[PDB]
Amino acid sequence: MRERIREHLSSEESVGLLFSGCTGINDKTLGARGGEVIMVTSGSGMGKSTFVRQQALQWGTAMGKKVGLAMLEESVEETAEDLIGLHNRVRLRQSDSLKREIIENGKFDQWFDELFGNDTFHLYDSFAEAETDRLLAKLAYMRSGLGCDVIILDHISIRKMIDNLMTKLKGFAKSTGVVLVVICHLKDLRALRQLSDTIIALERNQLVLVRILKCRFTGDTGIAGYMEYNKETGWLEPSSY
Amino acid sequence: MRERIREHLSSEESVGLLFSGCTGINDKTLGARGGEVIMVTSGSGMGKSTFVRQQALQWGTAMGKKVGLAMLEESVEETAEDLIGLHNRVRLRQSDSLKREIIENGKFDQWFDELFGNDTFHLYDSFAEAETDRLLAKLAYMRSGLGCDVIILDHISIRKMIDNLMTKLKGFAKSTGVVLVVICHLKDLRALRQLSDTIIALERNQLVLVRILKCRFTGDTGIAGYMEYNKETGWLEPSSY
């Protein structure tokens, strides 16, 4: 047992992929570990996507990880547009001028390569269909075929569709070891709660309050901290609340 | 009858193994007596294992008792890691640093012997199989072969598997006289209720509320008190609620 415990101790990964922008989030969760399902939830338009996107950006950009992004609601272009802006600390969607300026400027192309030039980000859309298996098959491919370290499922609202899916999702994450972040629309009580390993909730006015509704691994619950949305850069920043 | 009553009076063990950390629990139960089945239940991640583990630690450590631990879900190493941390008032699982520091430090080994060096704790896993008799046979051995005073079954969720098992469990405890603590997952009404001699339930936010759902021997029901989980030491502490 001794030797058995020892190696077990020295082989265990407690700290996963560290989150960004919120001082305290890592304290109460110790980051995202492989095989776990992270659930990021809150009210519509409360900043879920932004937050996740930011995590994705840092993970694949600074952590040198491969990030797959599966969009159920919006298109790839939309997603790409969002990441590009984010990476360049500008809101493309809000500036008809910038979009126009950047294309003839040649900055679009320079931006596109400096972000997707590499084999780091994998964006997939057109899952508009309500079939789970069709979805799991793509996810599995993103894992195996594209070697994605993190998979972000955007999004789900919240029957068996969700119940069974959550159970399929959790099974996929646990057996492969990928990090599966799922974005869910809330319109704790608010499978969703059960299978999810860590549940993060953002709150606003009723500056965004980051609440850790659940963390199996750590058990440490409560509010991790606050973030301040930069309307000019579109980045959620750490706060001094 | 007189002499018959007398010796009966002076031979009866009313107070069993006293519980720890919760001021009031012993008041309403008078501890754990041999031949009784203690059922500790609550919601998943509500602190069941910790609480039991704590009892186990004190029993085998301060009460000079032999404690057998049979794990159905997790591994021995995991359990050992938990007890070691607990005994050393540190959360090994939450600190990649501490785990690493303690091994080269030589504190791991010192810790391992200072806890399992003796013949006091008996951890058994690999009961992954859904066979009762296979399980009872091991328990019986832990009692007879290893002379365990207390046996902790971790865990059960939650048909006849449970019904028959609970009935087998209760039969094993009553005939041998060992103290059998069983951890059950609840997802009073929540054999489970019938065979169990004392049922303890922990409640949280939705500080942990310790509710005595049932105690045959004493009949004294209700909430025994409150405990405060120390996120730094992992110990459940008595509260001033």
Place this chain on the structure above:
Amino acid sequence: MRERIREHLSSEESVGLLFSGCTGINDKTLGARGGEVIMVTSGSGMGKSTFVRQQALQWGTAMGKKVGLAMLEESVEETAEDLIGLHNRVRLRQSDSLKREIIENGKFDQWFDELFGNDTFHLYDSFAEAETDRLLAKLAYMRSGLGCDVIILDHISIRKMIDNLMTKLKGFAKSTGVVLVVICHLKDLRALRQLSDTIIALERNQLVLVRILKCRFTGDTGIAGYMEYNKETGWLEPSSY
């Protein structure tokens, strides 16, 4: 007929042995009459024995009656211990200290004589065997030989064993005129119902609710009142609900 009615009127015993601790129970039943079978039932650990024991105590102690107690499940010592505590308003079973203190104190012996010194209580156990006739023969002896006014059968759970027994019990009570109180475990619909003259049920939380499920003589059904269990004295007290 006139003279015939007259003496009949002046010779009829309407009010039997009055019950104690529950204000209203006597209103709806007019006490326990000879030749009747009183059935006290409820959920396990709901206070059946206590209640009956209390009645027994008062009957044999204050009403100057001879009470026979036949225990199928527990031992005489256990029963004696319970009555002694009850009579002395203390819970011997819950205090390892008191038991010890009382024996060297000399209070045990003083207590024993002040209760069983007389020829008032007759405790019989060892009916562990499932034979009715063996049982009826003892009951009949308790009636005839020991002249018991009240016989308490503790207990019955829960075929013909019960059916035939209930029919034998009712026959024994009717022909001798003794008061037969039977304690039955319920795990109205819940011979048991048919032969029983009065059926009392205790209800709890899932303060005890005393419900009169049936009373042939009076026909007056419903809830007689409430009782409050004194965890320190072990006595069920009348309530102000």
Place this chain on the structure above:
Amino acid sequence: MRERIREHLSSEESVGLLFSGCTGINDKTLGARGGEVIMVTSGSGMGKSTFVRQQALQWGTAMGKKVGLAMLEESVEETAEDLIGLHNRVRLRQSDSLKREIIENGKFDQWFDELFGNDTFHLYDSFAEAETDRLLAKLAYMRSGLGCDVIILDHISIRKMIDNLMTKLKGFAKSTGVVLVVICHLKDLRALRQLSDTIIALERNQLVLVRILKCRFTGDTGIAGYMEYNKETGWLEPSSY
């Protein structure tokens, strides 16, 4: 035929002895006609006797009819005691005090004459024997010898004894023209059904529901209404359900 029909029309008794206490019973049955067998049935202790007794009381008291009462189970004194109480709106059987008070008071005797002083009620018991003919012979005498208008058979539970008796009963009622009310214990499907002209069933809680299971003459079936038992007067009263 014309004259034949006419006199037939003006000679036919459609409305028999009207029942009391239940608003609606007369609507669905048009009372009790001579030569008919009324069957009053229900569960033991459900109020059969009371109801019949009440009818008997009114019939012989207000309707100026002669009522014979044949008791198979209980004694005359018991029956007399019940009628006396009923007539005086008091429950003699439930008050050891009243019984005692009334005898020395001189009210017993005054009550006895004011009820049985006249030649209106004829109570007969001691039919304990299971012989039909012995029974029919007495009934026939009560009809012919004592000129009873109504005969109440109390009671019958649940072969040929009943089959043959019911057939003998129905034959006796039809040929003499007396009103035969029979009380039967039920432990429609529940000769009993066939020979009986009207079948009344009382139902309780699992306030008494009066159900007309069958009425040859009228064919009008269903629930006639509800009654409320007065625990202080022992009278079944009409309800506002």
Place this chain on the structure above:
Amino acid sequence: MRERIREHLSSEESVGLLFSGCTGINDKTLGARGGEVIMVTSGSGMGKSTFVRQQALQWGTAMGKKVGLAMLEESVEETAEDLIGLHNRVRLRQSDSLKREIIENGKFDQWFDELFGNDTFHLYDSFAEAETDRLLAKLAYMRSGLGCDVIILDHISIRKMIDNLMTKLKGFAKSTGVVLVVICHLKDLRALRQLSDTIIALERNQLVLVRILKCRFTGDTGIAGYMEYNKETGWLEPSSY
């Protein structure tokens, strides 16, 4: 054959006397044809007579047919009383008042003539004797002498009496061509079945269900529909079940 078939086709009476009050009965039987024996059966007091009487009333009243009614059990007056009420949509038998009011009112006589004034209905009773031939001779006379189009035999319960009678009945109907409706008491399997051309059964609660147990001519079996008995008019009405 051609001409032979033709006239055969144009000379065949498929639709007999149409029934009334039950929407669907004519669908599955196409009415009552001459030379056929209609058997109306069901439980005692289930509405057999009423139903037949209603058919009789309409046949002789609206269809301008001559209806003979032979009563084995009851008297003519009884039958007349029933038809008169029926024709006047009132229940004479249930109203001691109406009977009395109608006679002095002069409405009885007006009613009697407006129904039996004509030579349409022929009521015969006093067949109390169990002799078939005595019965057949009267029936034959009702056919030949009184020219009855429909003969209703009321009633028969379920030997040769019935067997031979049914065979005599069927022979009489087939050779004369009259419509013979027979009412039989049932206490398909329930000559009776064999000789009868159409068998109708009424069912009640476990509103009356009209079941066509057998129809030679049509072969169309099953439940024809439902009827609703009007307790105030005594008429069976068509239902919306």
Place this chain on the structure above:
Amino acid sequence: MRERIREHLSSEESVGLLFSGCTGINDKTLGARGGEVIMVTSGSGMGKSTFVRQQALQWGTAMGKKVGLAMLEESVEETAEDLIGLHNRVRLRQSDSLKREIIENGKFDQWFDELFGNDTFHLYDSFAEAETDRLLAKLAYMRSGLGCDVIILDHISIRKMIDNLMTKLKGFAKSTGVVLVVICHLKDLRALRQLSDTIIALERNQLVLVRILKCRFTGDTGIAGYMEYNKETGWLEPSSY
């Protein structure tokens, strides 16, 4: 023997006239062969005639065979009426309207020729006499004189009349080679069984069940399948039971 076997093999007619409407009947009988006596039996009004008539219709209509029909009970017109309706999928006997409409319509005549215009069907009645030889002589003529391929004997109920007839029938069929279908009334055990080559039984409610009680040639016994009677067309249809 070889050549002897060969030609024997290539000259043997195993499959006779195939039956219609019942999927499976041909499986278990392989149709009707010449020289065989087919016995169709069941309860009165169970659909015997219809079934046979249907076979007859198809045989003479689609199989281009000559079908003789000898009716013992009913008339030719009746039979013709039945075939005409059948061929035109309408129930002439059930519609006084259709019969009337079809005659003035000119459809009767068109129908008559389109069915009997040819020399395919030969209907013979008036065998009311109980003489066998008179009957055999006609049958023989239908075979020889009219060259009938199939002869349907309708009907016989299940002495020597039947015994001797069955033996004469079987002798006639075997020596001529015609297909003789006989309809028998049943009021296996139910010459009839012995001489008959194939026995078919129809059963109803517990839709008609077609049971193959016996088939010499094939030996294959049991229930061949089910049929559904079309009350609007009068045709027995194959079922999906």
